[PDB]
Paper text:
The PHD-catalysed hydroxylations of HIF-1α/HIF-2α in higher animals occur in amino- and carboxy-terminal oxygen-dependent degradation domains (NODD and CODD). The three human PHDs exhibit different NODD/CODD selectivities, with PHD3 being substantially more selective for CODD than PHD1/2 (refs 16). Biophysical analyses employing crystallography and NMR reveal that the molecular basis of PHD isoform and variant selectivity involves enzyme–substrate interactions involving β2/β3 loop residues (that bind the LXXLAP motif) and helices α3 and α4, regions which display sequence variations between the PHD isoforms.
Using biochemical and structural studies, we identified four more residues in α3 and α3-βI loop regions (PHD2/Ile280, Arg281, Ile292 and Gly294 that are substituted in PHD3/Val102, Leu103, Val114 and Glu116, respectively) and which play roles in determining selectivity. Indeed, we found that FG2216 (IOX3)35, used in clinical trials for treatment of anaemia, preferentially displaces NODD over CODD from PHD2.
Author numbering: 188 to 404, 410 to 414
Write the structure that this text describes.
């Protein structure tokens, strides 16, 4: 439960061996429920987008939209338990530093809160960072109480590079997930038939991010 102990005795060895690490009961029921309440309040007050355009119909009232998102800094009114989550994620990662491969983590994104609305949409197979944009670790926290994928779908399926197999991860309440963001971990979200919430942060590697600046391209006027 102390972040350093979880980091050294579980996350570091699990990440270095498998590139994927699942931590259940990360924050406990009380805090997890508070975060759920904050995310549902965001949803109920219209703070999410309308959802990824999945099917563009000739009649636009027929369009199908999928995952909805909102970006959260962690200090907004009504988001402070999400901020607490983000701090706890940061504490874990920082207590791994120097031991997650050869990466040196020096920053992260804001939190991306995602809501799959339960209409049979998921997320196609993809790699989070396929082109060297600086992101080395993906961290996802799940909020869905009593989630059963045989009933509601929504499994996260990862295809770790170099295996004739995949890893199915249920989006279970108070579950934290780490995985390498690059091509080692292509993954997909299978169709969700119930409202499915998750909060993602990506962590940056100092070297990769520093040279991403070059490739991706700040101008000083003359
Ligand atoms: O939610 C999950 O278990 C896994 N989700 C994703 O891998 C995922 N990845 C990306 Cl890059 C996006 C990107 C935008 C919106 C939602 C995403 C998402 O749910
Ligand atoms: Cl093992
Ligand atoms: Mn992804």
């Amino acid at each position: 439960l102390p972040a350093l102990k979880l980091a050294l005795e579980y996350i570091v060895p699990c990440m270095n061996k498998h590139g994927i690490c699942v931590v259940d009961d990360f924050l406990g029921k009380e805090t997890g429920q508070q975060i759920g309440d904050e995310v549902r309040a965001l949803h109920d007050t219209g703070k999410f987008t309308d959802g990824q355009l999945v099917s563009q119909k000739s009649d636009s009232s027929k369009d199908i939209r999928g995952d909805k998102i909102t970006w959260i800094e962690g200090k907004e009114p009504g988001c402070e338990t999400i901020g607490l989550l983000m701090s706890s994620m940061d504490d874990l990662v920082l207590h791994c530093n120097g031991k997650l491969g050869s990466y040196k983590v020096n920053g992260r994104t804001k939190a991306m809160v995602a809501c799959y609305p339960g209409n049979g949409t998921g997320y196609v197979r993809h790699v989070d960072n396929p082109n060297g944009d600086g992101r080395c670790v993906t961290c996802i926290y799940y909020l869905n109480k009593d989630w059963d994928a045989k009933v509601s779908g929504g499994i996260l399926r990862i295809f770790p590079e170099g295996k004739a197999q995949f890893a199915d991860i249920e989006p279970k309440f108070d579950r934290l997930l780490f995985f390498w963001s690059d091509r080692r971990n292509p993954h997909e979200v299978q169709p969700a038939y119930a409202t499915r919430y998750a909060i993602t942060v990506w962590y940056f590697d100092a070297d990769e991010r520093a040279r991403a600046k070059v490739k991706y391209l700040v101008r000083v006027e003359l």
